[PDB]
């Protein structure tokens, strides 16, 4: 839900960056912070799932 | 492109991809499927 | 002022596929020639139907009386422009002179459409143009003119509201949605139903009910299929008047497959003998089958085709190649065992194959921005 | 190059093919080639028939080991997630 | 004749407001609106509500006409089984006014609607057969009941344990393959029943398992992402050339 | 030559149309297993193929279509008998059908078991591909494809 349902509210902003074109005040950067959060969110889940391969054997 | 030897040598068109499968198979079909009524 | 000539287009398809009656279609065509002053309607029918003998002076004194009625409207252009008024002078040279398109060919059409187009201050007169472009494109099978005028009709007339002629547009594009292939928007624009009531351009509303009910058995899903007819008030009384259509509607919900092959042929008879349904009936046949076969195979995980012979009455080798040609085309993926008389369900689309739309459509997507990334720079 | 394909092509996998049915392709009458097949194939030499036992053949599971290498696949996969990072 | 009944009803639409005061027309038209529209099977509660409106307008009129008015409205409560208006009408002071013989048999019919209970419904079916004849449509009223009351007793037997043999569970409904199991096969289609049968060994298996959660939340967002790049393709080709 | 192709008019252009008409109905005869229809396409439309120089495949494409025809039937049915698929694919004889199915197993095309008496072919549904196996193993190539483009975007970003 944070990796999908948050995507559409994040990926509407590039369609909001399309004006079109161009009557709306620019620039605006919506890239952060969800992108890097979901990155680290996998970094939490990948190395915690490595506990299967790390702890065991 | 146009270099090398490149230059040297809804719609119904979209449905025609599926429609041609009707041409070589089972016609449409009404009459035959309508004849199958009294067959058995 | 359409249906009398709009039925000549019905006579064209009545002459087109069946060759049986050439006299019955030419009598009411000549009856439509002796009235309404039709010229080209019997000229393009003169090649399809019999070449008489003689029409000529019988219908030439008409086109002369037409010319007398054409010249008096062409005399009305410089007689009314002698005075001055807003839109009133040149409004007489559109509706009746584009009624001369109904007389013959495109001469009345093309020259009277653009000649009156710039003056009109009201959207109702601009749509009468678009109207008469839709009838000539119904008469002659050319699909060009009826696509462009509707695009011009949506911009100007919809600005803006109207009750009457705007509901006709939703019928036109809906009729265009069934003229070309669109299932979902056909019945969606037909949702207006009796709000359009009956008009010269709406022909018989009971026939308009037949047009929307035949698309509503595919595009309108089974939960919504029974909903629109039963919960819908104004649409329910007109379907109960027809015992043939209402039967097949409820029998579809009753799931009995014995009455389908009979009643579906009755619908196909109307689908065969109606214009603009000739290219579109081929996929319509087995699309109502898979619609009945969708709920079929969803019922049991293991089903014997001999039990299907009961309902089908009696499918043995018929559904053997039939259901096999459904799977090969991607319609209703299923496993039916041969000579073992078992059908297997499946296919669990809730997990595996449903994931594939992500990367597959995302391949050409990301590929398009790979190549176009190497373009910047150079 | 065709003769050695009678053993290779026809199976795997068929159940049982009768004596004279295999002789129809091999022609001759009762050659030592089919006798050499009874040695080479092995497979089976049945009376008036040939058998594929047992069974069809070797009954592949295939293996319960690949669960190991599946954990090996996650090793470099989680490493690629750390390369970005 | 439904179209002829509505045509006679349509002519009454402008007839009620034609004269000065009906004196009773629209109220009678409401009962007539509870006939054709009820034949249309529009809404069970609204048509039953027109009988309540007519019953409010039936006060101080001929008693034989009023004593047969409860024949239609209280037996209309039989078809619905969920009017929710049960206690409103019959327990009010206006509906308790009739002590006559014919309405006393109707008072227990209004109680028979509160009963349901196919053990009792099949019993009183013979006792009320006289009132069953006065039913305007005898089949449809009790067909929608018997078809609905079918699964009412079926959801009782199938509920307690997950999987059941199809031969004995359909022995209480007296048969299997012809209609029941085909109607039960329609229950998966109507979503009222989640499960699957077994034709060979005769064991009905119920599984609610296979959810759809993560998947449609993924691919459907990517289909929208196809509109992000295609719409950006206009920006791409425009700035470059 | 892949054996899996749809109708190619979805790639057609009004300018390319007139030129692809002899090459159009070709693939329309590939989707079907009829010999009389396939050989008639080679006779009439073989003139257009002379300029392309594509005649190398026409001898091996007959073996390609018979694989598409049997894949259409094998995917549509659990069991498929050799005698019923004999004339349906018009192999006309039981003996060459044993040769085709044998080479079909050699190419990994079909999983069908065969019970030889007359004989007949009795197959079964192939499963266990499931979920935990193929998608996550394929995703190793998907992400390795995607994470490289992250570098491709950085490299393209470093030039400006």
Curated annotation (Swiss-Prot), chain A:
Widely expressed. Highest levels in heart and skeletal muscle. The modification Phosphothreonine is found at residue 13. Component of the 19S proteasome regulatory particle complex. The 26S proteasome consists of a 20S core particle (CP) and two 19S regulatory subunits (RP). The regulatory particle is made of a lid composed of 9 subunits including PSMD4, a base containing 6 ATPases and few additional components. Within the complex, PSMD4 interacts with subunit PSMD7 through their respective MPN domain. Interacts with TXNL1. Belongs to the peptidase M67A family. PSMD14 subfamily. Component of the 26S proteasome, a multiprotein complex involved in the ATP-dependent degradation of ubiquitinated proteins. This complex plays a key role in the maintenance of protein homeostasis by removing misfolded or damaged proteins, which could impair cellular functions, and by removing proteins whose functions are no longer required. Therefore, the proteasome participates in numerous cellular processes, including cell cycle progression, apoptosis, or DNA damage repair. This is 26S proteasome non-ATPase regulatory subunit 14. It comes from Homo sapiens (Human). The gene is PSMD14. The chain holds residues 254 to 310 of 310 of the full protein.
Curated annotation (Swiss-Prot), chain D:
There is a cross-link at residue 32 (Glycyl lysine isopeptide (Lys-Gly) (interchain with G-Cter in SUMO2)). Component of the 19S proteasome regulatory particle complex. The 26S proteasome consists of a 20S core particle (CP) and two 19S regulatory subunits (RP). The regulatory particle is made of a lid composed of 9 subunits including PSMD8, a base containing 6 ATPases and few additional components. Interacts with DDI2. Interacts with TASOR. Component of the 26S proteasome, a multiprotein complex involved in the ATP-dependent degradation of ubiquitinated proteins. This complex plays a key role in the maintenance of protein homeostasis by removing misfolded or damaged proteins, which could impair cellular functions, and by removing proteins whose functions are no longer required. Therefore, the proteasome participates in numerous cellular processes, including cell cycle progression, apoptosis, or DNA damage repair. Belongs to the proteasome subunit S14 family. This is 26S proteasome non-ATPase regulatory subunit 8. It comes from Homo sapiens. The chain holds residues 266 to 350 of 350 of the full protein.
UniProtKB/Swiss-Prot annotation, chain E:
Changing residue 91 to A: Does not affect phosphorylation by AMPK. It is found in: Nucleus; Cytoplasm, Cytosol. Keywords: Acetylation, Cytoplasm, Isopeptide bond, Nucleus, Phosphoprotein, Proteasome, Ubl conjugation. Induction: By FOXO4; expression in embryonic stem cells (ESCs) is mediated by FOXO4. Highly expressed in embryonic stem cells (ESCs). Expression decreases as ESCs differentiate. There is a cross-link at residue 93 (Glycyl lysine isopeptide (Lys-Gly) (interchain with G-Cter in SUMO2)). Its main location: nucleus. Residues 43-211 form the PCI domain. GO terms for biological process: proteasome assembly; proteasome-mediated ubiquitin-dependent protein catabolic process; stem cell differentiation; ubiquitin-dependent protein catabolic process. Phosphorylated by AMPK. One of its GO terms (molecular function) is structural molecule activity. One of its GO terms (cellular component) is cytosol. Component of the 19S proteasome regulatory particle complex. The 26S proteasome consists of a 20S core particle (CP) and two 19S regulatory subunits (RP). The regulatory particle is made of a lid composed of 9 subunits including PSMD11, a base containing 6 ATPases and few additional components. Belongs to the proteasome subunit S9 family. This is 26S proteasome non-ATPase regulatory subunit 11. It comes from Homo sapiens. The chain holds residues 182 to 422 of 422 of the full protein.
Curated annotation (Swiss-Prot), chain F:
Residues 1-128 form the PCI domain. The modification Phosphoserine is found at residues 81, 93. Component of the 19S proteasome regulatory particle complex. The 26S proteasome consists of a 20S core particle (CP) and two 19S regulatory subunits (RP). The regulatory particle is made of a lid composed of 9 subunits including PSMD3, a base containing 6 ATPases and few additional components. Interacts with UBQLN1 (via ubiquitin-like domain). Interacts with ERCC6. Component of the 26S proteasome, a multiprotein complex involved in the ATP-dependent degradation of ubiquitinated proteins. This complex plays a key role in the maintenance of protein homeostasis by removing misfolded or damaged proteins, which could impair cellular functions, and by removing proteins whose functions are no longer required. Therefore, the proteasome participates in numerous cellular processes, including cell cycle progression, apoptosis, or DNA damage repair. Belongs to the proteasome subunit S3 family. This is 26S proteasome non-ATPase regulatory subunit 3. It comes from Homo sapiens.
């Amino acid at each position: 839900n944070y990796n999908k349902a948050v995507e559409e509210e994040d990926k509407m902003t590039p369609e909001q960056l399309a004006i079109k074109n161009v009557g709306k005040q620019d620039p605006k950067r919506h890239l952060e912070e969800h992108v890097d959060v979901l990155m680290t969110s996998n970094i939490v889940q990948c190395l915690a799932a490595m506990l299967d391969t790390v702890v065991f054997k | 492109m146009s270099e090398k030897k490149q230059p040297v040598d809804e719609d119904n068109w979209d449905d025609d991809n599926v429609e041609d499968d009707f041409s070589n198979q089972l016609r449409a079909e009404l009459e035959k499927h309508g004849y199958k009524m009294e067959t058995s | 002022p359409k249906n009398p000539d709009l039925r000549i287009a019905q006579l064209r398809f009545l002459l087109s596929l069946p060759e049986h009656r050439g006299d019955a279609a030419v009598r009411d065509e000549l009856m439509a020639a002796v009235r309404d002053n039709n010229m080209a309607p019997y000229y393009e029918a003169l090649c399809k139907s019999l070449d008489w003998q003689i029409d000529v002076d019988l219908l030439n004194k008409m086109k002369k009386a037409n010319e007398d009625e054409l010249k008096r409207l062409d005399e009305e252009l410089e007689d009314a422009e002698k005075n001055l008024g807003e839109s009133e002078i040149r409004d007489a040279m559109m509706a009746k002179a584009e009624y001369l398109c109904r007389i013959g060919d495109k001469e009345g059409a093309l020259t009277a459409f653009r000649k009156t187009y710039d003056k009109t201050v009201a959207l109702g007169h601009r749509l009468d143009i678009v109207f008469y472009l839709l009838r000539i494109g119904l008469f002659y099978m050319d699909n060009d003119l009826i696509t462009r005028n509707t695009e011009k009709a949506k911009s100007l007339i919809e600005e803006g509201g109207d009750w009457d002629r705007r509901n006709r547009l939703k019928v036109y594009q809906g009729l265009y949605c069934v003229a070309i292939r669109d299932f979902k928007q056909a019945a969606e624009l037909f949702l207006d139903t009796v709000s359009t009531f009956t008009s010269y351009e709406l022909m018989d509303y009971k026939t308009f009910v037949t047009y929307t009910v035949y698309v509503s058995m595919i595009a309108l899903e089974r939960p919504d299929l029974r909903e629109k007819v039963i919960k819908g008030a104004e649409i329910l009384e007109v379907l109960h008047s027809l015992p043939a259509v209402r039967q097949y509607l409820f029998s579809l919900y009753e799931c009995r497959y014995s009455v389908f092959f009979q009643s579906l042929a009755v619908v196909e008879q109307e689908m065969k003998k109606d214009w603009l349904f000739a290219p579109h009936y081929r996929y319509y046949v087995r699309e109502m089958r898979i619609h009945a076969y969708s709920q079929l195979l969803e019922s049991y995980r293991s089903l014997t085709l001999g039990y299907m012979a009961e309902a089908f009455g009696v499918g043995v080798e018929f559904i053997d190649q039939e259901l096999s040609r459904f799977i090969a085309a991607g319609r209703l993926h299923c496993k039916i065992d041969k000579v073992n008389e078992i059908v297997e369900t499946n296919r669990p689309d809730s997990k595996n194959w449903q994931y594939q739309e992500t990367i597959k459509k995302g391949d050409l997507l990301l590929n398009r921005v790979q190549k176009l990334s190497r373009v910047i720079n150079m | 190059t065709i003769r050695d394909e009678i053993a290779g092509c026809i199976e795997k996998a068929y159940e049982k093919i009768l004596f004279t049915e295999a002789t129809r392709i091999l022609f001759f009458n009762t050659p030592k080639k089919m006798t050499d097949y009874a040695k080479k194939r092995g497979w089976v030499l049945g009376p008036n028939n040939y058998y594929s036992f047992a069974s069809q053949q070797q009954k592949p599971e295939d293996t319960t080991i690949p669960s190991t290498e599946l954990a090996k696949q996650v090793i470099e996969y989680a490493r690629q997630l750390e390369m970005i990072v | 004749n439904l179209p002829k009944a509505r045509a006679a009803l349509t002519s009454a639409r402008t007839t009620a407001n034609a004269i000065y005061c009906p004196p009773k027309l629209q109220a009678t038209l409401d009962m007539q609106s509870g006939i054709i529209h009820a034949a249309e099977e529009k809404d069970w509660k609204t048509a039953y509500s027109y009988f309540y409106e007519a019953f409010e307008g039936y006060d101080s009129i001929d008693s034989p006409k009023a004593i047969t008015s409860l024949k239609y409205m209280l037996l209309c409560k039989i078809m619905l089984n969920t009017p929710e208006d049960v206690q409103a009408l019959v327990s009010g002071k206006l509906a308790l006014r009739y002590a006559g013989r014919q309405t006393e048999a109707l008072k227990c019919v209004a109680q028979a609607s509160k009963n349901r209970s196919l053990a009792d419904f099949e019993k009183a079916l013979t006792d009320y057969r006289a009132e069953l004849r006065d039913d305007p449509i005898i089949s449809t009223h009790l067909a929608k009941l018997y078809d609905n009351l079918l699964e009412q007793n079926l959801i009782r037997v199938i509920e307690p344990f997950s999987r059941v043999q199809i031969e004995h569970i359909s022995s209480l409904i007296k048969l299997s393959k012809a209609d029941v199991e085909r109607k039960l096969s329609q229950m998966i289609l109507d979503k009222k029943f989640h499960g699957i049968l077994d034709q060979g060994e005769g064991v009905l298996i119920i599984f609610d398992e296979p959810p759809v959660d993560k998947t449609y939340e993924a691919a459907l967002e990517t289909i929208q992402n196809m509109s992000k790049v295609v719409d950006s393709l206009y920006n791409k080709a425009k700035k470059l050339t | 030559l892949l054996g899996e192709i749809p109708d190619r008019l979805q790639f057609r252009q009004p300018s390319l149309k007139r030129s692809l008409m002899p090459y159009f109905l070709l693939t329309q005869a590939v989707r079907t297993g009829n010999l009389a229809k396939f050989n008639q396409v080679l006779d009439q439309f073989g003139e257009k193929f002379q300029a392309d120089g594509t005649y190398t495949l026409i001898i091996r494409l007959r073996h390609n279509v018979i694989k598409t025809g049997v894949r259409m039937i094998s995917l549509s049915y659990s069991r498929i008998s050799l005698a019923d698929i004999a004339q349906k694919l018009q192999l006309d004889s039981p003996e060459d059908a044993e040769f085709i199915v044998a080479k079909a197993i050699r190419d990994g095309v079909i999983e069908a078991s065969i019970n030889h008496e007359k004989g007949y072919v009795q197959s079964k549904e192939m499963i266990d591909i499931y979920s935990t196996r193929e998608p996550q193993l394929a995703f190793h190539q998907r992400i390795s494809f995607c994470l490289d483009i992250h570098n491709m975007s950085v490299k393209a970003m470093r030039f400006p």
